[PDB]
């Protein structure tokens, strides 16, 4: 498919939201990314 530039910025963003909860946020909060998404398993909008 041919993605537009906006579609891309979004796909981009979605990709970053897909990272882990930084190691330090764990210690800082004295101890889960509920928005983790697999390319195959899950499905993005658009």
């Amino acid at each position: 498919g041919k993605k537009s530039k906006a579609t891309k910025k979004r796909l981009a963003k979605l990709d970053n939201q897909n990272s882990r909860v930084p190691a330090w946020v764990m210690l800082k909060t004295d101890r889960r990314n509920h928005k983790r998404r697999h390319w195959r398993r899950n499905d993005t909008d658009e």
């Binding site: 530039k5 891309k8 910025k9 796909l11 981009a12 963003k13 990709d15 970053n16």
Partner: protein, 81 residues
Amino acid sequence: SWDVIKHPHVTEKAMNDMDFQNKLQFAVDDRASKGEVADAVEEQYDVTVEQVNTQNTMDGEKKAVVRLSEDDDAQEVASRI
């Protein structure tokens, strides 16, 4: 008011274009054109830009591969920052 140049895109492949083709790679504002990217780069580091290739990265930022004239030296411009 946005700025044209965000910061130097330093990575291995970025280093090569520098040590081997006198090219500097930047992360520039995605609303900026090659021409605007050229000027900015010149006025900022005081060099002569010959050509500028852009690309809209999967990081939501626009990467620009800037090639300097033979008068300027990438490795040197980069070293000062």
